[PDB]
Each structure stands twice: as structure tokens, then as C-alpha cells.
């Protein structure tokens, strides 16, 4: 995929808000900057916005470790 810095995901389920304090992101989305929150929400940026919502429900820190550096 695409492992790089900060607390990243994939999503494994399919979203569909788009924009909404919340994302339509599919699966294998990869949003950045990560943290639940009120529970099992999640946040970071997927996109033109900067940090909406996606379920803990619908998300995972990539259950696929190792990660190699770039230049």
C-alpha cells in the first residue's frame, strides 16, 4: 500500500459521507493522523478536509506491520 510516518490506517469496510465530519472513504482508504475519540471514532485527513470521522467499527492500524523508508 503506502506505509509512511504518523498513526495511519486502512480501511477495511467501505464509508459513504464523503464530507460530513465524516468520509466516504472506501476500503483500503489510508487516512492519516489517527486517534479514537467519544468512544470508537476515529479521526485524519482523507482527502481536501483535515481530520473528520471514521468508525473504529470501520477502521484498523493496518494489520500489517513493517514499513520500509523512504529517501
Same mark, same amino acid.
Given at each position: 500500500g503506502s506505509?509512511?510516518? =504518523?498513526?495511519?490506517? =486502512?480501511?477495511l469496510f467501505d464509508? =459513504?459521507?464523503q464530507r460530513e465530519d465524516e468520509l466516504?472513504? /472506501? =476500503? @483500503?482508504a489510508i487516512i492519516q493522523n489517527v486517534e479514537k475519540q467519544e468512544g470508537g471514532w476515529w479521526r485524519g485527513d482523507?482527502?481536501?478536509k483535515k481530520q473528520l470521522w471514521?468508525? @473504529?467499527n470501520y477502521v484498523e492500524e493496518m494489520?500489517?506491520?513493517e514499513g /520500509?523508508?523512504?529517501?
Open positions: 506505509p509512511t510516518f =504518523k498513526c495511519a490506517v =486502512k480501511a464509508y =459513504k459521507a466516504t472513504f /472506501i =476500503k @483500503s482523507y482527502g481536501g471514521f468508525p @473504529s494489520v500489517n506491520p /520500509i523508508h523512504r529517501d
